[model samples]
Target: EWQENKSWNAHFTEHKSQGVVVLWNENKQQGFTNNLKRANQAFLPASTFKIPNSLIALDLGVVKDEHQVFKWDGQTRDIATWNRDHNLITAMKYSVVPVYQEFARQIGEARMSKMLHAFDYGNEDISGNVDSFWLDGGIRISATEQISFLRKLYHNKLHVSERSQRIVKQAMLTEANGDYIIRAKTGYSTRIEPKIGWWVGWVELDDNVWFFAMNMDMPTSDGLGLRQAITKEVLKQEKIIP
Candidate 1:
């Protein structure tokens, strides 16, 4: 589960620090990860927390389907898509926080916390303000834990209903290219020191699964898309992609 692949290490050189952890076995090669120990450290899930929230909301009947839409209150937000109304699918694609915050409010903390335990989310802390807990509260998960959670859904091992898992993964589809489809979620947590960013998901190939979780500190800039860019490079190095 650990490897001395410093290739991902260089990407963090220009920034404060980063923890990159990847887990995958293709029925041939051994699993590997860079900075294996650091990847074990817990950090806020940020927007990535939505992965579990979506399932809980759907299962709780708080929202009907992925098409369930939330009308924007016309408040000017930094992101363009967030400025307009969005449904579960669109909101997830855009990483719209407020829409999920609404979902959290409707679902309520007690119910949400209960579902989180059922899901076995990181530390399972849904404390603080219901809407801001994942953003600023005590809920924390390591990059390793992120992959572990994802792998459960990857293999349908989680206790949640199959429909809930199916819909959440459906909405997580971010990019598809030829034989490879990447289902992922990006998270940016600026509420903490050094600022943390994450891109967690997996690539589905002909007969293999490559799961990854990347967390970095972009203290000077947003470094939004770098998450995918760096992960793709590693996937290429592993020959998972062309």
Candidate 2:
């Protein structure tokens, strides 16, 4: 069941944003949320799709391994770090758009479509352009759906090979304390109307994983940090983080 957890409202107000956070505990099979209505509304996944995109590329052999370097072609990007070469770990860490775009290009439309179907990702729609669909395409997934997909990825239940899932799980790692580890992806859909910001992943602690999917109306880029900050605050409020 989904507890409203409206106590989280103060954190969003502090950040001056409105959105939803869906949290699931695989250990207890419990769920919590701040807004049930927004949690079910699907939206473009943006770079958060990279989580599955990485899995697909590895399973499809688009890249040989996590260390496989995606060479840069000297094109300038808004993010300076993206102007250079990168491997999967770095690309995932930095949310390198062009780097994943290259992976999408190599994955191609047919294979990409097949993989999306296999993964049951989003709406399973990669329309628009093979390389840009997740960015501005028809793919739409709600916060609740995101939690379901993440649970599968966390449990290696997706159709992707276990090896591929393990590799992507490694790539998704964002934080590791002695007691807890956080693996997540951030997304920003700038091309879409009422741009959205997302921070979706899970926290691993005490042999249990707590999955979360968060999306907030990003009125300006300045509000992007709240995507993760608010999530963390709620996690702390729930004592998932100390």
Candidate 3:
């Protein structure tokens, strides 16, 4: 069942943006959402798709390990990180779109399509350019669906090798303190109308894990920081973090 927490609305209002937050308590098997309508709404997975893409790449031996480096073509880009060579870890930490786009091309259309279907990721529609599909193509996943996929990844339940899942999970690590660990990915889709920003992943505590997916209407770049700020605020209110 869907649980609504109106008190969480203030977090979104604090940023003056409309969005949705879905949190699933793994141990409790309970779900929480701030906006039901928006929670069920689907949007481009954006770089968030990197979680699965990384898994597929590793499982197929596409890059031999998280340490294998991908050479930078020296093509200048907006993001400074994009101009440097990167491996799975640094690439993920920087959210380098070109690096992942290259990974998609290496996976090829046939294998990438099959793998996406295997993971039950979003609409499983990788039409258009394979490399850019998740960026601005047909595939779409809702906040609830995102949490579902993450829950599986957290348990190494996706249709990929356990080793591959483990590597990708480790790559997603964002914050690690003594008592709690936060693993997540942030996604921004500016090419799409009504630009969307996403912060999705999970939190691991002593006894349980909490999976959360958040997306907001990003009218400006400020929403980039707001994405994480709002989610962390709600998470703190839930006592999931400090």
Candidate 4:
């Protein structure tokens, strides 16, 4: 997805200095990062929590399979196009909230709390409204913590079943080319002040994998695309991609 990103630089602050943070670990050989000071700072994880939520939904049977479709009830939302039916992958690609929010309602808070504690999900906090925890400051995590979770998932090192792991892993495949595949999820804290944006994912390589997390505080969604753009820039700077 970083292909032909000529004008993305126009909108982004700068290559070496920006509010963005990119953490890289290639077989533990790390390089080219910015903003570690805030890397460990926690905030509502927003949609990036969906990565783990996807796994939790599967493991609990709240979501039996990706093929199971949930029809859109034809309600208008902030994003008009989310008004259609969606499966797990489609919902993830689009970051559709209502369906997964419904999943949380069905999965319930007690269940989510236990899983968060067990998975050691960032801050291990799911304290606000059951459906809006990750959205509105109930659950919080730092960029460093995001990488911790993602690294575990990528290595199948989490306590969750491989079946659940495999499914969520497959759901993250966003792009694939002849020799590279990118698996990622993006997050934006919509209702929080000094709103936060997140792009967390990894690059699959023949030998070693490159894991990354990038986030920035944007006053509006106008700068949202920079979530991925900054990560892609760092990936190229680190030579993880051509």
Residue by residue across 22-45, what tens digits does model 3's lDDT show?
999998899999888889888998
Which ten residues in a row are the worst by lDDT in model 2?
A: 1-10
Clashes of each: 0, 0, 0, 0
What ranking of all candidate models by lDDT puts the best one first? Answer: 3, 2, 1, 4
Worst 10 residues of 3 by lDDT: 219-228
For candidate 4, report its TM-score.
Answer: 0.90
Say which prediction, candidate 2 or candidate 4, comes out ahead on lDDT.
2
Candidates in order: C-alpha RMSD to true structure: 1.9, 1.0, 0.9, 4.7
Candidate 4 structure quality by residue, lDDT tens digits, 129-212 = 889888985688887788778888987888788888988988998888977789999898878765878888888988878877
lDDT digits (tens) for residues 24-108 of candidate 1: 6645445677777767889999999989988888888887888877899888988787999888899899999999998899999
Better lDDT candidate (1, 2): 2
What does the lDDT come to for candidate 2? 0.90
Ranking by TM-score: 3, 2, 1, 4
TM-score, model 1 to reference: 0.93
Measured on C-alpha atoms, candidate 1 has an lDDT of 0.82
* TM-scores of the candidates in the order shown: 0.93, 0.97, 0.98, 0.90
Cα-based lDDT at residue 189, candidate 3: 83
Q: Which consecutive 10 residues in model 1 have the weakest lDDT in total?
A: 21-30
Candidate 1 error regions (>4 Å)? 14-17, 26-30
TM-score, predicted candidate 3 vs. hidden true structure: 0.98
